Amino acid sequence: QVWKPYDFLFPAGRLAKLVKVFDVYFKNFPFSDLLNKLKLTEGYPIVNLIGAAQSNRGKFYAGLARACFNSEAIIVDSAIETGLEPYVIRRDLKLVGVAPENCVKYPKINSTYKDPYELSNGHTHLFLVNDKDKTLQWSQETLFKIQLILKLAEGKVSKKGPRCKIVNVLLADTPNYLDEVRLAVKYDLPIIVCKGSHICDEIIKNSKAQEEEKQWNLVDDEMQELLQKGHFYMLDSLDSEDIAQYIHFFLTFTPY
Amino acid sequence: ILKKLQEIKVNYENREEKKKLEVVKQEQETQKEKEVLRKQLMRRSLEQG
Secondary structure (H helix, E strand, O other): EEEEEEEEEOOOOOOEEEEEEEOOHHHEEEEEEEHHHHOOOOOOOOEEEEEOOOOOOOOHHHHHHHHHHHHOEEEEEEEEOOOHHHHHHHHOOOOEOOOOOOOOOOOOOOOOOOOEEEOOOOOOOEEOOOOOOOOOOOOOOHHHHHHHHHHHOOOOOOOOOOOEEEEEEEEEOOOHHHHHHHHHHOOOOEEEEEEEOHHHHHHHHHOOOHHOOOOOOOOOHHHHHHHOOOOOEEEEEOOHHHHHHHHHHEEEEEOO | OOHHHHHHHHHHHHHHHHHHOOOOOOOOHHHHHHHHHHHHHHHHHHOOO
């Protein structure tokens, strides 16, 4: 058995579905059977958060959650606390976390100290991925995360229709964003670069600068090449209404 | 009469045997209940944190 589903109860929190994947490199992973068992069988619009971690973006996440609610979109992140959780819980949004099982901790009952890599309350579905040797690190789950996103957007094969729209939101609050951006560009997916992280602020600043004035101090050369090849959209706002308008636009229309 | 005396002896022994076993059985039954209760308690204390 390549995967096993569980009911996961967050301490003082919601009941989630937790799926352990025992081999992330398994050829032809049975996503159809997995998603049928989770009742995730419709095609859903997807908002994928790239490099999501704990950040001071509170009102921005309220706008993002509103746009996802109005579009019936599933949010996909890295299963750790981001500050989106209160808005997701209140609106009954589907929040899907994908993480390596070895890189995350299970929440402790009545713990006075939250670990920054603890699974956050608000996730409705958790995908904990492993290799055979249980040595998986951050970025190695990224291929599984994108394949899951593509299958969630396609839904059941019997629905003859185009897949639902997928938008990526580059937060870059963690340094491990590069592999996920590389895969998003490879699948021709739109990427919203959101203000608030040092990496995103540098990208936005350099997008407005003339070529001769561009200074890259934090962004790797590979990311600079990806910015020319991919569909990147700069959001120089932390306003809840501006992110909601961007997400709603990209979930409804493809501008390229 | 010898047969009747032997029946009376066997009935006395059987009545004596029939008391104590029931008492021991009640104590054995008396445990198990604590384990079931304690398992329910532990599950619910875990749910309540």
